[PDB]
């Protein structure tokens, strides 16, 4: 009991089990560790980043290897619409003969792959279980590279200084140009060279790539400027993916819409997209100043941006030193951007499927959308939590203030009451009225008179759909009109492909919407606004309030301020994150429920079921949950079991973890300390067990630890039960 | 890049003069012991105790490989596969088309014999106070001194003799595995070739 | 030794032996003194 929390002497002197619990939960809070400097902080974060990237690459290599070894990738190539992809084999000694038989796929029990990796790897030009093995080998090599780099940059002569870590202009130039633009350029190179011929039956491997021309003219049009030659003769409308029948020779085209066979974006479209992105990012990577006297100094840009009339105070003068010296501001910005980006991925990979035959893989579509939306919610909550942490421990009012006047960030704490009050008003407005309309529909339909329902046509959103070319709402607006300047401009470039895809009932591109979509979008807006209210209130009130005008002196995470002055439960900024996690889970649940029910009705064909029953709550409860839960719960019955048996077990497991979270959330400490004391007395006063005594005094979990454990149980149960439900329902309903 | 130093002057490598001379074996041992204490103090890793124990096991295993070859050649080593109905589905290896290929019964028997020997080893490990030679080093005990390139030529039942024979047996196992991997035959096939034919006869 | 014997060789190994040794090491480490 003197060397586990090596980074904290205060914890290492704790005689109780709290030392072990807090040793885990404070291991990555490097700024709070004993004998801590900024240089060591940045160096340790750098090495941890290297180890993390190595972990990511090892995970991808493992996926590749297990698909290559125990999957059916090669068989799935020849029949992608009937063969179900296999993730990996199963060896579990607890299986009975029935479980072995039900999970048996080809040669061994195996799990279907819901990650969509088969379609992704097939699209980028993989046709052999030896191509996957090469990828796994290369990724393990890259992981070894990253681990070696992480070790190296902790060595004495190779540890970077604070100036290098805080060199904003150099890092931005390189990140933007090199990372984004050059990675897009290399991806365009791969796309063209390998993927484009492989979709046309020509194999371009690591042997015949220096001799197989990606285009017949071969780099002559690029240098000659005849760039149109790369767009001539695109893939026809009768092209069979992976075969030369009906193929073309173009490598960079505008076609819009989807491939007629795979129902996915054209490979030549994506290569052109990545080439354009590469050029744009390489250009944008020269903005900031470096050792060659030209570029921008972002301190000057920030300082010079003060509106002349004066409404943002003194502008952004103190923001450069504020962001540079704080790792929580940057982390919050990065997390917010990543959350928006993965929300974008979720919202675009279902409307615009980019991988061949992924549109017809309904379980993987649902799994991908749900996974990315949950990750998005997590990232957004993390961004706001780290903003609150920045307020608590990194914000300096003196830097953000010049002669009494406050800069753009410090002014957010002046009208903080206005911001919180208006967030509260919007949340109450949306909640009151969305619930009112939903309950009105509930009562009116229940009384047998559905005609009295309040159904608001989402005209604003249908207006946007018509603007993009959907001739379904009779708006004749911009691209629904053939005479508008928006249509004549692109009538020869990408409208014929785009219009043919948007005006198709079998796509998810701009799904038709009705009053149910209106109501559920308002519910989503309410969830977003309430989660934002909780997080913004916690961030702004992090440094203090009327109930605790010295909250900054207690840190980001503390249990409370006591029992007097009223009370003081959940007063810290960490508690705001803790409360907003429930609202994030609820909002993501609403979003994923809406998406999954809409797509289940679209795939099954009974879109009239959603359009009618989605306007009232009992419609949701009866036709989504109760209706589609039947295949899942019958994964094993007193008569037998199916391959969905694991999903029913996970369903029950998620319910159990959810209710254990309920334990940890409803029942607080103090009730568990006295019980533990009784147990301690019982152990101390019993023979044959007095010979064994604890080294750490058993104590109840701390208030903050209990909140974290209850939140973890709640979230894990939530995620597990919904994943089981969505996957099993899709599989058991749509064959 | 230019207006600052990537590596601070206070964080620079210093040449370790404490390893002057100190042939690669001594240098490697010292580096392992300094870098990984509490596993070096136990005698684990590149240590004379570990080398002696592994040599003993390698010699005994050369004996075991000879015995296994003899048993395979002489009609011993039971035939068939394990009964999945008797030993559960964990003994099933694959199902090609309607038949369950199980773990061979010979493999199960050999695993049981190896389990006997490994159990004896585990007992001796958790019997430190009653065995002549312990598995690990006591706190304070110091690792016997490395024998060097050539251990002393002391015939009989001597520490040097056992040391040399253990090194020879471990090298023989390394060579056997290398030959089997490079050429592509079974381990017992390589042993049979290396005995002329007197084993699998 | 075929490739299909690798699951039966590795899954017990990892999923039982690695917990045992990891628990031994972690318990020893967190119960150390100074």
């Amino acid at each position: 009991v003197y060397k586990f929390p090596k980074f904290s002497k205060a914890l290492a002197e704790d005689p109780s089990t709290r030392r072990i619990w807090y040793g885990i939960a404070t291991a990555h809070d490097f700024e709070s560790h004993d004998a801590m400097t900024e240089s060591k902080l940045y160096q340790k974060i750098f090495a941890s980043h290297f180890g993390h990237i190595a972990i990511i690459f090892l995970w991808t290599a493992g996926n590749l290897f297990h698909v290559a070894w125990q999957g059916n990738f090669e068989a799935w190539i020849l029949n992608p619409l009937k063969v179900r992809p296999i993730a990996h084999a199963i060896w579990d000694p607890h299986f009975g003969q029935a479980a072995y038989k039900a999970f048996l796929k080809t040669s061994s029990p195996a799990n279907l792959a819901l990650s969509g990796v088969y379609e992704w790897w097939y699209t980028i030009g993989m046709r052999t279980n030896n191509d996957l093995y090469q990828g796994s080998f290369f990724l393990i090599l890259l992981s070894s590279l990253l681990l070696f780099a992480g070790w190296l940059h902790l060595q004495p002569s190779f540890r970077p200084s604070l100036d290098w870590f805080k060199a904003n202009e150099y890092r931005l130039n390189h990140h933007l140009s090199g990372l984004f633009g050059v990675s897009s350029l290399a991806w365009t190179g791969h796309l063209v060279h390998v993927a484009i011929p492989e979709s046309r039956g020509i194999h371009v491997g690591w042997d015949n790539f220096l001799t197989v021309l990606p285009h017949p003219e071969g780099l002559t049009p690029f240098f000659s400027g005849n760039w149109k030659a790369y767009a001539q003769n695109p893939d026809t409308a009768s092209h069979i993916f992976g075969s030369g029948e009906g193929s073309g020779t173009a490598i960079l085209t505008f076609l819009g819409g989807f491939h007629p066979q795979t129902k996915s974006l054209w490979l030549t479209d994506m290569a052109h997209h990545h080439l354009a992105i590469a050029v744009l990012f390489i250009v944008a990577g020269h903005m900031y100043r470096t050792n060659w006297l030209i570029g921008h100094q972002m301190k000057l840009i920030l300082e010079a941006h003060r509106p002349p009339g004066g409404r943002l105070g003194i502008g952004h003068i103190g923001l450069y030193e504020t962001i540079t010296n704080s790792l929580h501001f940057q982390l919050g910005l990065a997390l917010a951007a990543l959350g928006v980006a993965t929300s974008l991925t979720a919202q675009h990979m279902y409307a615009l499927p980019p991988y061949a035959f992924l549109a017809s893989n309904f379980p993987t579509q649902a799994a991908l959308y749900t996974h990315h939306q949950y990750i998005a919610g997590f990232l957004m909550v993390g961004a706001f939590a780290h903003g609150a942490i920045f307020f608590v421990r990194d914000y300096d009012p003196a830097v953000n203030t010049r002669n009494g006047e406050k800069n753009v960030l410090a002014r957010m704490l002046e009208h903080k009451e206005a911001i919180i009050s208006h967030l509260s008003w919007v949340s109450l407005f949306l909640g009151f009225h969305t619930l009112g309309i939903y309950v009105h529909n509930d009562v009116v339909v229940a009384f047998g008179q559905p005609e009295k329902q309040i159904l608001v046509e989402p005209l604003f959103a249908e207006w946007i759909q018509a603007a993009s070319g959907k001739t379904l709402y009779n708006f004749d607006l911009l691209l629904a009109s053939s005479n508008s300047p928006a249509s004549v401009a692109s009538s020869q470039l990408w409208l014929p492909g785009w219009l043919s895809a948007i005006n198709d009932g079998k796509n998810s591109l701009f799904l038709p919407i009705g009053p149910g979509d209106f109501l559920v979008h308002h519910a989503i807006a309410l969830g977003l606004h309430t989660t934002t209210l909780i997080l913004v209130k916690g961030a702004l009130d992090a440094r203090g309030s009327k109930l605790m005008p010295d909250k900054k002196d207690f840190g980001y995470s503390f249990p409370c301020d006591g029992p007097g002055r009223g009370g003081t439960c959940d007063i810290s900024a960490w508690d705001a994150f803790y409360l907003a996690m429930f609202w994030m889970l609820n909002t993501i649940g609403w979003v994923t429920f809406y998406w999954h029910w809409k797509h289940l009705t679209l795939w099954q064909g009974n879109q009239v079921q959603f359009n009618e029953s989605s306007n009232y709550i009992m419609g949701w409860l009866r036709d989504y949950l109760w209706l589609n839960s039947s295949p899942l719960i019958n994964g094993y019955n007193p008569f037998g079991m199916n391959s969905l048996s694991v999903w029913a077990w996970m369903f029950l497991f998620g319910h159990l973890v959810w209710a254990t979270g309920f334990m940890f959330l409803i029942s607080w400490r103090g009730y568990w300390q006295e019980l533990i004391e009784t147990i301690v007395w019982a152990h101390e006063r019993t023979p044959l067990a007095n010979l064994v005594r604890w080294k750490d005094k058993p104590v109840a979990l701390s208030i903050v630890q209990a909140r974290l454990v209850g939140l973890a149980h709640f979230t894990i149960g939530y995620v597990l039960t919904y994943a089981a439900f969505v996957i099993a329902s899709t599989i058991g309903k749509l064959g | 890049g230019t207006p600052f130093d990537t590596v601070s002057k206070d964080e620079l490598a210093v040449e370790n003069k404490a390893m002057a001379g100190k042939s690669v074996f001594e240098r490697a041992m010292a580096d392992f012991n300094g870098r990984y204490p509490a596993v070096a103090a136990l005698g684990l890793g590149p240590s004379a105790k570990a080398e002696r124990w592994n040599g003993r096991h390698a010699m005994f295993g050369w004996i075991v490989l000879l015995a296994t070859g003899y048993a395979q050649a002489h009609g011993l080593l039971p035939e068939g596969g394990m009964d999945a109905k008797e030993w559960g589905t964990w003994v099933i290896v694959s199902t090609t088309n309607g038949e369950q290929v199980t773990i061979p019964a010979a493999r199960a028997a050999i695993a049981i014999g190896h389990l006997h020997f490994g159990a004896v080893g585990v007992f001796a490990a958790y019997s430190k106070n009653s065995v002549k030679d312990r598995l690990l080093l006591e706190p304070g005990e110091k690792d016997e001194a490395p024998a060097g390139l050539f251990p002393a030529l002391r015939p009989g039942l001597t520490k040097e003799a056992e040391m040399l024979n253990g090194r020879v047996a471990m090298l023989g196992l390394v060579a056997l595995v290398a030959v089997s991997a490079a050429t592509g035959q079974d381990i017992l096939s390589v042993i049979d070739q290396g005995l002329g034919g007197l084993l699998l006869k | 030794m075929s490739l299909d014997l690798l699951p039966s060789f590795f899954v017990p190994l990892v999923g039982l032996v690695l917990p045992l040794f990891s628990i031994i090491g972690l318990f020893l480490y967190i119960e150390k003194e100074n």
Partner: peptide, 30 residues
């Protein structure tokens, strides 16, 4: 179907990546 040699050398390379991982783990200190 991948061969025994392919899986074996991938396992050996994985071992090398493991020794590199503990070296990074031990260098990030106890």
């Amino acid at each position: 179907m991948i061969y025994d040699s392919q899986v074996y050398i991938a396992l050996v390379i994985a071992v090398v990546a493991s020794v590199l991982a503990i070296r990074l783990g031990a260098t990030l200190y106890n």
